[PDB]
Amino acid sequence: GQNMRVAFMPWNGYNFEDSILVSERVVQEDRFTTIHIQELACVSRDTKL
Amino acid sequence: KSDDVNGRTKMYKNIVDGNHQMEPGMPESFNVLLKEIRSLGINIELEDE
Amino acid sequence: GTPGFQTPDARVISRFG
Amino acid sequence: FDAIKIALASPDMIRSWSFGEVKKPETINYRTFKPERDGLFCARIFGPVKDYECLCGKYKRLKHRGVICEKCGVEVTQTKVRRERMGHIELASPTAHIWFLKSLPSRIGLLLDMPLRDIERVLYFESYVVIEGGMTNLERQQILTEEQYLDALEEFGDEFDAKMGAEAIQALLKSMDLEQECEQLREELNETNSETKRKKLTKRIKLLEAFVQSGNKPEWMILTVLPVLPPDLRPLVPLDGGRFATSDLNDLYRRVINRNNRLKRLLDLAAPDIIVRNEKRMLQEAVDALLDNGRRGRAITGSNKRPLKSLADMIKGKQGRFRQNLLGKRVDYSGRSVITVGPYLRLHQCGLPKKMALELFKPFIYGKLELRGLATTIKAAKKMVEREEAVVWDILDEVIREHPVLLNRAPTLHRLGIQAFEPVLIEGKAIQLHPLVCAAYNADFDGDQMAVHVPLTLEAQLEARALMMSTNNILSPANGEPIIVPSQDVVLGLYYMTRDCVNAKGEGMVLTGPKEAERLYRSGLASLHARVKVRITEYEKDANGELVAKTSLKDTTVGRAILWMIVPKGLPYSIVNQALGKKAISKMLNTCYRILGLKPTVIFADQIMYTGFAYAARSGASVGIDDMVIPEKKHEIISEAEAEVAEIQEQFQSGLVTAGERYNKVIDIWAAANDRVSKAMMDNLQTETVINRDGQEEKQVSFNSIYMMADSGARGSAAQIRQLAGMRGLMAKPDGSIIETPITANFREGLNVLQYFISTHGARKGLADTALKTANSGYLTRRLVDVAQDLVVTEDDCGTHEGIMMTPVIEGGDVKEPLRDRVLGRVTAEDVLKPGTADILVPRNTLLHEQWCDLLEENSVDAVKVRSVVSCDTDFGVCAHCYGRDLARGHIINKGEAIGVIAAQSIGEPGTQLTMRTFHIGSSIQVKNKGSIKLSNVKSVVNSSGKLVITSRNTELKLIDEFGRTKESYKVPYGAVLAKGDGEQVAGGETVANWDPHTMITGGLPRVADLFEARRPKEPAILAEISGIVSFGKETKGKRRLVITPVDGSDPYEEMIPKWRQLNVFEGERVERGDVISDGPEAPHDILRLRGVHAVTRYIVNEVQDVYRLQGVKINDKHIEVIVRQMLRKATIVNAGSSDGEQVEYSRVKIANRELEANGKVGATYSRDLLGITKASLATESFISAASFQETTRVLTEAAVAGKRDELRGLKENVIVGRLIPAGTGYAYHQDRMRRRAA
Amino acid sequence: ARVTVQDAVEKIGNRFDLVLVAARRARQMQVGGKDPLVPEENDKTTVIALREIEEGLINNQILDVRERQEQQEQEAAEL
Amino acid sequence: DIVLNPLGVPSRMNIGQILETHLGMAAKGIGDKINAMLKQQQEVAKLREF
Ligand SMILES: [Mg+2]
Ligand SMILES: [Zn+2]
Ligand SMILES: [Zn+2]
């Protein structure tokens, strides 16, 4: 994972039950961005027509 | 929303026409059940109307 | 006090003693 | 249609459905893939493969539809008809139907009162059987083997016919004369006693007469023609890529066809017996595997050890048809996503992603775009919404406006699992949920997912606003307490506000109003905890319902004055002057609702949340490693107990104490030391904070963060703190349940490997218990809903004074639940009088809302007879009066509201919070509270000592205090030491009870399942049958004998008891009916029979409420009472009355017997029969409803031979056919529709 | 945004019948049936029917009166 | 960076997340120091000693 600067305090109920309030800088810096790869194939096969 | 092969189309056309009213029919699974039960020495039918 | 059951309180074991 | 019927299928009626005969076990060509002639997929027998097109292709269009092309015999029609066209196979030899043979009550078995084993033997061609003997050495029915039959034919060539196989059983069913046989069994039941003559006779006669009633014929048990299922019901559709996908039904049918064809061929081929008998058995095997596979041999599909699924398997079970398809389906116009908090929402709204909104409301958007000229045709609007044009977004706003959507949490324990909200369009892919509703859903923001449903019809949009709206449901139906309550941060902020500390900045000053308090805090001049006193104007409406405002100055804090601004007008401000944690934010909300109503309370809760979140945010309220302060004494206390155990160690190593003695010793001393440590840290926490008042020290309640969280109720309680900052008690194994070496360390110091490993023992049983309980709680709640569904509020009033007597549950010293809580919301059975007899506190019958409860509470009253559901003069339902009041709304229950389902839910939702095992741990009486001794039902006498002694087993000890209420209840055994007597005045604890020590389930959730099932206990207690001195028997022969001795008249009753069972009843003493001659656990049947309906309906509730009381669960007795009512719905007649040992429904016995008792005729006496939930649900008028829930095969077979009929008259059967359920709105529609029908 | 139907339920006994009557009135309004008896305010047909229920100018009896009268309104078109 | 909830600490035991935080701060503070002495570019002596 990543090193995050955490502070323990409520904030307008934006972390009410277990929700997590994350700064906009974190998403700016792309440090939690994930690169995924998907494989999808087109199959041309014989049919009646 | 699930069964009633006719009801789906009827409701969709009504919705696209601004009319929100349902003409409910017979769920298809129930007619399948009637056919399956009748596939035995069992005779299950429906009465007048 | 309430069956938890990890530790006892008065009458039964409990989730929190 | 308006009803459904099920009956036997005659061979001609079987051919009626069929449109052709299947001759060859072929499906398609293998190079053309077309349906072969006479194959299972034949287009001539069933229909064309393509819509409005002929197989040969000569006839192609809608121009000509009704015609059978002479080319291929195909009729050009809609291909969907291959879904409805049946077929038939002509069986060469008769074949028996498996259901009518293998089902528990074998139809053919007791239809000829032959045994199942012998029929099975005859079918295997292992013996013969005689039929229509006439004047023969043998009977009309008999069995004989090969040699026996060999030389039997020469005796009588004629008049003696003995067949073998299925033909024999059929012919035995055909020439059988049912009336002739029946007309004898009647007499065989009349003259001859000895119930063995009444065991199957009384059921065989029923079977015969029902068979005659249905009109169907017995010969149809043996299938002459085999019906086939349409091809589209078992498709061979190509699975792409390439490979085909078929139904196991096809393989079974193929086998059947192959075997019938081989039998025909051999018949024409003139083969000997052994071969053809093997072939007949193969055909029977194939047929039975096609109908209900697994009962005999479990034929297997090729290329697999997996059995091929047969017809019967496509109906029964949680999987299959009934449970998985008809009662529940995947539904269009729905979505799923992860929920997250948006507090800015109102209670009636929720944030919905725009991406989901576009897809869900697609038809609405298309229509709206085409309406405003923005789109030429529907396709243009499709392409527009596909292109993500800006113009559509506004349109979305137009179509979502005021359109409720149903939000659902994955697990649905009770109806609150689904609630409707007003959509609020948001970006992102996360769904925003309102915090106040999380308690109702039982949903956290730890990754839980929720689903959404869009109501289509206008009626559904109204039902999502008046019934299922988030704001129309606040207080739970199971108990009056509101389910919408601030949870964690709201109550924390409010507790921080209402808190007060001495010497805060500006303490003691005065302010004009709350506005100035806010202006003083936000300016940094005054704090929020100062003890300031200000002026506030509170509103009170009085003396005619006319609001009168009140102005004055009060002893308060700045923060409480600021909080007063949110409180609605009508509240008294005494609600705002205290610590203000969660436990009474709850009561503040409840009082606000039951004073001002729904509309003020909704916005009140919204404002509470809005303010609490921001205040808890700006308060900081963090947690550090220093916040957990360990007591400095802990070291010494731990060392002291640790040394204390060494003496015990020396004690056992010698023999002065046993192993168990020493173990209990050590465990007790360690538990006491743990008490000491926790107490030390708690005393150092609660009064921890000490500061200078006006310049001098003083100690007050602390401001410690974790302690504030404990005290407010926002989060972890004291048991958490004891482990946070002190020795965390001692752990427990799966069983053994406590270990001698406790955990000296607290979580802050850190655990060592050994103690952590010890803790994992108790940790596992906790985690594991939750997972497997999830499976069983579902079963319990499902059985509960199954036994309750059709029960609906159908009448306004029943008109019975019966009810039940409501008395407070005063167990032992004090009360577990006051009487107000067990009476509130219900209706009085008869006029309660003031304690001074002959007056009127409440009229005959009225709904007791909070005002009458307060009135009763003031006057000395612990006696109120409350009308109950169990005892009610209503048929096929319950009337609103006797049931009482309950809802989210607090008025009398409405009519047509289905209460059985909501009661099953009220009992099932808490079922997940219970546990699987209890494992409990733990002698004169000492009265606690000052009052007056009041004995109940005690016979006594005076002896040498001069005081009083008890001569009766049952003796209750009540206490009439200075008020007159009874808060004490104690039982004293025979021969007690009475110091005062009945109606004396005790001091503050004078001991009036003394005797000697000797003279000489799981439980939890499984327990609840046991109580609702009326399961006999392990070692039952038995009960006396009538008053009178008991009498002993002959001697110990097997068990023992016990002779009942009634006093006056009929005194022949008797029973037999084992001498191994100890006895408790007195010998020469009178003992009334329903008394404990033997100590032990009681059974519901015995209580019902020997005490009555109300006694047992009180026992069930009182016992099933203990397990829920143990766990923090609170549910009104009303739902348990409705369940109990549904249990005892059956009864058995005694005297046969005017018209016909039988068991029937109580309501029917009344409709038949009381109406005739009016007519002056003879009365019929019944006997209440007690059944479990599953057993009571097993018996239902509707056979569709029963076949849905359980045992589809048996229920359907029995309803088939019975020719029974179903008008659906109910909920489950209505959802099965997709109709308006007869309740709620469905009740309003069905009322008008049914009023005009059958009349 | 009619959050609560309390006042609307006050006019009609059942919380269920409210739904039926409001749905009939909303049928009248949404489909080409009729015009609203309250200023629209942009609220949907459902909420307009609920508001008419609140005002006391619409319920089962009144709808039946109007429909029964319109029965005869179409019996005079035959001269 | 992130704002957690204090109420999550007392309900669960889960105390590590507190300590792992505190020590973390310390383990981060050092970096600042080592950054400063590198941003102030003093020499290998101060770095080595500290
Ligand atoms: Mg969760
Ligand atoms: Zn043709
Ligand atoms: Zn009643």
How many angstroms is it from D448 CA to the middle of ligand 1? Answer: 5
Cα D1100 to Cα A49: distance, rounded to the nearest angstrom: 71
Q: Of the candidates B4, B39, B34, B38, which has an alpha carbon nearest to the alpha carbon of residue B22? A: B4
Neighbours of D788 (CB within 10 A): 26
Neighbours of D697 (CB within 10 A): 8
User: Would you say D18 and D227 are in contact if contact means Cβ atoms under 8 Å apart?
Assistant: yes
Q: What is the resolution of this structure in A?
A: 3.3
D371 touches chain E (CB under 8 A): no
Q: Which residues of F touch D (CB under 8 A)?
A: 5-11, 13, 15, 18-19, 22
Structure tokens at D441: 């859903």
User: Would you say B5 and B28 are in contact if contact means Cβ atoms under 8 Å apart?
Assistant: yes
Centroid of chain to Cα F26: 4
D176's CB contacts (< 8 A; 6+ apart) are: D111, D112, D218
Cα D673 to Cα D670: distance, rounded to the nearest angstrom: 5
User: Nearest CB to A22: which of F2, F6, F28?
Assistant: F2
Centroid of chain to Cα D436: 26
Cα D264 to Cα D680: distance, rounded to the nearest angstrom: 94
Please give, rounded to a whole number of angstroms, the shortest distance from the CA of A46 to a CA of chain D: 8
Mutate to test the interface with F, among D340, D488, D496, D715 (most CBs of F within 10 A): D715
- Would you call A15 and F4 a contact, using CB atoms and an 8 Å cutoff? yes
Q: Indicate the number of domains in chain E.
A: 1
User: Would you say D89 and D254 are in contact if contact means Cβ atoms under 8 Å apart?
Assistant: no
Nearest CA in chain F to D624: F18
Please give, rounded to a whole number of angstroms, the shortest distance from the CA of D27 to a CA of chain B: 19
Q: Of the candidates E45, E42, E3, which has an alpha carbon nearest to the alpha carbon of residue E22? A: E45
Please give, rounded to a whole number of angstroms, the shortest distance from the CA of B19 to a CA of chain E: 6
Output the furthest CA–CA distance in chain D (Å, rounded).
129
Strand pairing report for D970-971 and D956-959: antiparallel
Is the backbone peptide bond immediately before D1003 cis, with ω within 30 degrees of 0?
A: yes
**C-alpha dihedral sign at D316, D317, D321, D327:** positive
User: Would you say D726 and D680 are in contact if contact means Cβ atoms under 8 Å apart?
Assistant: yes
Domain extent for E73: 1-79
Centroid of chain to Cα D796: 26
User: Nearest CB to D715: which of F7, F13, F22?
Assistant: F7
According to DSSP, residue D325 is labeled I
Structure tokens at D427: 């970006």
User: Would you say E6 and D597 are in contact if contact means Cβ atoms under 8 Å apart?
Assistant: yes
F29 touches chain A (CB under 8 A): no
Q: What number of CA atoms fall less than 13 Å from residue A32's CA on the CB side?
A: 12
Cα D762 to Cα D734: distance, rounded to the nearest angstrom: 7
Mutate to test the interface with E, among B20, B21, B22, B23 (most CBs of E within 10 A): B20
According to DSSP, residue D878 is labeled E
How many angstroms is it from D419 CA to the middle of ligand 1? Answer: 18
Query: Which CATH number applies to D632-766: 2.30.180.10, 3.50.50.60, 1.10.3810.10, 1.10.132.30?
Result: 1.10.132.30
D446 touches chain F (CB under 8 A): no
Centroid of chain to Cα D542: 45
D494's CB contacts (< 8 A; 6+ apart) are: D486, D563, D580, D581, D585, D608, D611, D612, D615, D712
Q: Which residues of A touch D (CB under 8 A)?
A: 7-19, 43, 45, 48
D39's CB contacts (< 8 A; 6+ apart) are: D22, D24, D25, D26, D27, D28
Return the amino acid letter for D1054: E
Output the furthest CA–CA distance in chain E (Å, rounded).
49
User: Would you say D320 and D309 are in contact if contact means Cβ atoms under 8 Å apart?
Assistant: no
Under DSSP, is residue D1174 helix (H, G, I), strand (E, B) or coil?
Answer: helix
How many angstroms is it from D802 CA to the middle of ligand 3? Answer: 9
According to DSSP, residue D969 is labeled B
User: Would you say D108 and D100 are in contact if contact means Cβ atoms under 8 Å apart?
Assistant: yes
Chains sharing 3 or more CB pairs under 8 A with chain E: B, D
Cα D1210 to Cα D1181: distance, rounded to the nearest angstrom: 10
Cα D1095 to Cα D974: distance, rounded to the nearest angstrom: 24
Cα D515 to Cα D172: distance, rounded to the nearest angstrom: 98
User: Would you say E20 and D1229 are in contact if contact means Cβ atoms under 8 Å apart?
Assistant: yes
| Residue set of the binding site of D | 54, 56, 69, 72, 444, 446, 448, 798, 872, 879, 882
Q: What residues pair up with D892 in beta bridges, in sequence order?
A: D885
Residues of D in contact with A19 (CB under 8 A): 340-341, 445
Q: Region of D389 please: left (phi>0), alpha (psi -120 to 50) or beta.
A: beta
Residues of D in contact with F6 (CB under 8 A): 621-623, 705, 709
List phi, psi (to 5°) of C3: -60, 115
Cα separation values, D1227 from D581, D792, E14, F2, Å: 44, 9, 11, 53
In this structure, what CATH number is given to the domain that contains residue E16?
3.90.940.10
How many angstroms is it from D19 CA to the middle of ligand 2? Answer: 17
Q: Of the candidates E33, E30, E25, which has an alpha carbon nearest to the alpha carbon of residue E8? A: E25
Q: Of the candidates D970, D919, D976, which has an alpha carbon nearest to the alpha carbon of residue D945? A: D976
F6 touches chain A (CB under 8 A): yes
Q: What residues pair up with D228 in beta bridges, in sequence order?
A: D87
D718's CB contacts (< 8 A; 6+ apart) are: D682, D710
**Strand order from edge to edge, sheet including D18-21:** D18-21, D86-96, D222-228
List phi, psi (to 5°) of E37: -95, 0
Q: Of the candidates D348, D338, D342, D385, which has an alpha carbon nearest to the alpha carbon of residue D366? A: D385
Q: Of the candidates D61, D39, D40, which has an alpha carbon nearest to the alpha carbon of residue D50? A: D61
Cα D1149 to Cα D1147: distance, rounded to the nearest angstrom: 5
Identify the experimental approach: X-ray
User: Nearest CB to B22: which of D8, D229, D457?
Assistant: D457
**C-alpha dihedral sign at E32, E38, E39, E41:** negative
Cα D797 to Cα D803: distance, rounded to the nearest angstrom: 13
User: Would you say D226 and D249 are in contact if contact means Cβ atoms under 8 Å apart?
Assistant: no
Strand pairing report for D334-341 and D449-453: antiparallel
Mutate to test the interface with C, among D769, D912, D915 (most CBs of C within 10 A): D915
Whether chain A lies against chain D with 3 or more Cβ pairs closer than 8 A is yes
Return the amino acid letter for D1138: S
User: Would you say D1174 and D1186 are in contact if contact means Cβ atoms under 8 Å apart?
Assistant: no
B9's CB contacts (< 8 A; 6+ apart) are: none
Cα D147 to Cα D140: distance, rounded to the nearest angstrom: 20
Q: What number of CA atoms fall less than 13 Å from residue D369's CA on the CB side?
A: 27
Q: What residues pair up with D1043 in beta bridges, in sequence order?
A: D1031, D1054
Cα D55 to Cα D216: distance, rounded to the nearest angstrom: 40
Cα E58 to Cα E36: distance, rounded to the nearest angstrom: 10
